[PDB]
Design an enzyme around this catalytic site. Structure first.
Site, PDB file in Angstrom:
ATOM      1  N   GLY A 181       1.293   2.801  -5.789  1.00 43.57           N
ATOM      2  CA  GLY A 181       0.240   1.959  -6.381  1.00 43.57           C
ATOM      3  C   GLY A 181       0.375   0.553  -5.464  1.00 43.57           C
ATOM      4  CG  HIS A 189      -2.379   8.108   2.564  1.00 44.51           C
ATOM      5  ND1 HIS A 189      -1.767   8.450   1.190  1.00 44.51           N
ATOM      6  CD2 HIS A 189      -2.742   9.217   2.812  1.00 44.51           C
ATOM      7  CE1 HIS A 189      -1.612   9.507   1.185  1.00 44.51           C
ATOM      8  NE2 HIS A 189      -2.299  10.480   2.249  1.00 44.51           N
ATOM      9  CG  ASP A 190      -4.618   4.194  -1.400  1.00 42.77           C
ATOM     10  OD1 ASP A 190      -4.784   4.459  -2.461  1.00 42.77           O
ATOM     11  OD2 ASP A 190      -3.483   4.087  -1.070  1.00 42.77           O
ATOM     12  CG  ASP A 220      -1.902  13.719   2.114  1.00 45.38           C
ATOM     13  OD1 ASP A 220      -3.037  13.497   2.078  1.00 45.38           O
ATOM     14  OD2 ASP A 220      -1.222  14.274   1.190  1.00 45.38           O
ATOM     15  N   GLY A 259       3.866   3.914  -0.820  1.00 44.03           N
ATOM     16  CA  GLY A 259       4.332   4.169  -2.445  1.00 44.03           C
ATOM     17  C   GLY A 259       3.309   4.899  -3.325  1.00 44.03           C
ATOM     18  CE1 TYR A 279      -1.543  19.256   2.656  1.00 44.97           C
ATOM     19  CE2 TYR A 279      -2.461  17.893   0.539  1.00 44.97           C
ATOM     20  CZ  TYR A 279      -1.451  17.918   1.779  1.00 44.97           C
ATOM     21  OH  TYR A 279      -0.645  16.902   2.043  1.00 44.97           O
ATOM     22  CE1 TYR A 298      -4.681  10.983   0.134  1.00 42.79           C
ATOM     23  CE2 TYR A 298      -5.258  11.797  -2.115  1.00 42.79           C
ATOM     24  CZ  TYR A 298      -4.575  11.677  -1.226  1.00 42.79           C
ATOM     25  OH  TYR A 298      -3.531  12.599  -0.832  1.00 42.79           O
ATOM     26  CE1 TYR A 304      -4.103  -1.903   0.125  1.00 46.26           C
ATOM     27  CE2 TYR A 304      -2.543  -3.487   1.547  1.00 46.26           C
ATOM     28  CZ  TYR A 304      -3.683  -3.254   0.688  1.00 46.26           C
ATOM     29  OH  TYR A 304      -4.872  -3.987   0.751  1.00 46.26           O
TER      30      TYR A 304
END
Length: 123
Positions: A32, A48-49, A99, A30, A73, A52, A28
């Protein structure tokens, strides 16, 4: 945009950088990768993904630009802490929390240099 993320991890960990350590790690971390994680650090990226995505479901984000990437941002660092422009609307504030929450996990979880550059065949 993206270089801003590294900054969040740089503030929480000034003695080490992600692009020079957590780069291409787990499935996860990086940019991709995908599949079962390899350690607690990889779990942070996997989340983190997930952040989003939650941002897309948000109403404000639903009617903005259907793209949490071009949305850059403004933020800042200090006292091993992350600073984000409060002006950031609901979506802008949620993208930063994603983030920032990622850099805090890396500093709260261990890091295995061996799991670095894992094989997608394990994922």
């Amino acid at each position: 945009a993206l270089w801003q993320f590294n900054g969040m991890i740089k503030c929480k960990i000034p003695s080490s950088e992600p692009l020079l350590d957590f780069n291409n790690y787990g499935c996860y971390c990086g940019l991709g990768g995908s599949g079962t994680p390899v350690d607690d650090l990889d779990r942070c990226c996997q989340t983190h993904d997930n952040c989003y995505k939650q941002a897309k479901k948000l109403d404000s984000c639903k009617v903005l630009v259907d793209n949490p990437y071009t949305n850059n941002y403004s933020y800042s660092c200090s006292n091993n802490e992350i600073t984000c422009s409060s002006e950031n609307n609901a979506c802008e504030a949620f993208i930063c929390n994603c983030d920032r929450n990622a850099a805090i996990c890396f500093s709260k979880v261990p890091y295995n240099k061996e799991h670095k550059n894992l094989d997608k065949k394990n994922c």
